[PDB]
Amino acid sequence: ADLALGAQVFNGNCAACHMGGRNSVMPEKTLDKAALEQYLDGGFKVESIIYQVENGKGAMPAWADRLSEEEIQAVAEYVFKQATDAAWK
C-alpha cells in the first residue's frame, strides 16, 4: 500500500508506453537501470524519476495535474525498485 500503490499507478497510467519497463515511443529511453543513468536528468535516483513524471519530457506527458504527489512518489519508488532489482517483466 505504497509500493503496491506505485505498481497500481504504474499499471494504470504508465504501461501504455512502458510495458514491461520498455519504451514504445523512444525505444532507447528504457526503464532499466543502465538506461536511466544514461538518459535521466540527474541520474538514477528516485528524485530524478519523480521530477520527470511531474514535468514530463518530450513525448512523455506531465502527470502533475492528474496524479497526487503521493502517487507520484509511489510510482517513482516502484520504477526505482524494479530497475534496481531488475524485475522488469
Ligand code: HEC
Ligand atoms: C507514452 C505516451 C508515455 C506514457 C504513458 C509515459 N511515458 Fe515515460 N516516457 C515516454 C517517453 C517518450 C519518454 C522519453 C522522453 C524523452 O524524450 O526523453 C519517457 C521516459 C521515461 C523515463 C525515463 C527513461 C529513460 O530515460 O531511460 C521515466 C522514468 C519514465 N518515462 C517514467 C514514466 C512513468 C512512471 C509513467 C507513468 C505515470 C510514464 N513514464 C508514462 C513515454 C511515456
